[PDB]
Amino acid sequence: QATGDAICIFRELQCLTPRGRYDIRIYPTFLHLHGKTFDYKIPYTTVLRLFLLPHKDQRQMFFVISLDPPIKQGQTRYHFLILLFSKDEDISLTLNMNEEEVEKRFEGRLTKNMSGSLYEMVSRVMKALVNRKITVPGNFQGHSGAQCITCSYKASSGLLYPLERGFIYVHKPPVHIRFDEISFVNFARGTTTTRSFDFEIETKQGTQYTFSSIEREEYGKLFDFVNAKKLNIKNRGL
């Protein structure tokens, strides 16, 4: 329970990428992702984005850390650390420094002893350590009322989140596309099943991402969202 060199340690977190149970040890300039087999030291300067995303089931939360460069494990590359939390899990955290140092280091954002939901505590600590905002959903709401869309990417199914300034798909594999990177989007009829469509994104750098098998009922609100964000729909006739 003592944290030694570390400021604090989050133990036994469910990581989806990399997949497994990991501790996260917080240090001043990096976090140590400590697994039973592998270990990774991740400087805060390599954190590109932070996201806190509500799972469609209204019971879990994703915390996503986008990395640049990615972490390496043999030939595999992880461009994202994805943590999965139940909203009902709580944590009591004690920082391994005195009150004066906590105030000096974190400007009142943290205190030596803190309690709350585990996902909220991870977010609080990461925000204090990393010069990135906690990116959360904006005003998008789907046909059913959720803030994401069920779809397929590559060989698996997942969740597409229309955010204020980009799309993020989780979790296998994860993809983050900023709106400023998009050349155009396209809505295509789905071969897999009737009553579904594919949402294709073409980036300016010349790459295509297809989120497929989206229920037809989701079209209206995704169409309205893409228009509100000024993304070009190519094409509109046919």
Curated annotation (Swiss-Prot):
Placement of covalent cross-link Glycyl lysine isopeptide (Lys-Gly) (interchain with G-Cter in SUMO2): 104, 172
Compartments in which it is found: Nucleus; Nucleus, Nucleolus; Chromosome
Residues modified to N6-acetyllysine: 41, 221
PTM notes: Phosphorylated by CK2 following UV but not gamma irradiation. Phosphorylation inhibits its DNA-binding activity. Ubiquitinated. Polyubiquitinated following caspase cleavage resulting in degradation of the N-terminal ubiquitinated part of the cleaved protein.
Coiled coil: none
UniProt miscellaneous comment: Autoantibodies against SSRP1 are present in sera from patients with systemic lupus erythematosus, but not other rheumatic diseases.
Its biological purpose: Component of the FACT complex, a general chromatin factor that acts to reorganize nucleosomes. The FACT complex is involved in multiple processes that require DNA as a template such as mRNA elongation, DNA replication and DNA repair. During transcription elongation the FACT complex acts as a histone chaperone that both destabilizes and restores nucleosomal structure.
Domain notes per entry: The HMG box DNA-binding domain mediates DNA-binding. It has both affinity and specificity for DNA damaged globally with cisplatin.
SUBUNIT field: Interacts with MYOG (via C-terminal region). Component of the FACT complex, a stable heterodimer of SSRP1 and SUPT16H. Also a component of a CK2-SPT16-SSRP1 complex which forms following UV irradiation, composed of SSRP1, SUPT16H, CSNK2A1, CSNK2A2 and CSNK2B. Binds to histone H3-H4 tetramers, but not to intact nucleosomes. Identified in a centromere complex containing histones H2A, H2B and H4, and at least CENPA, CENPB, CENPC, CENPT, CENPN, HJURP, SUPT16H, SSRP1 and RSF1. Interacts with isoform gamma of TP63. Interacts with FYTTD1/UIF. Interacts with SRF. Interacts with NEK9.
Family classification: Belongs to the SSRP1 family.
Stated name of the protein: FACT complex subunit SSRP1
Protein species of origin: Homo sapiens
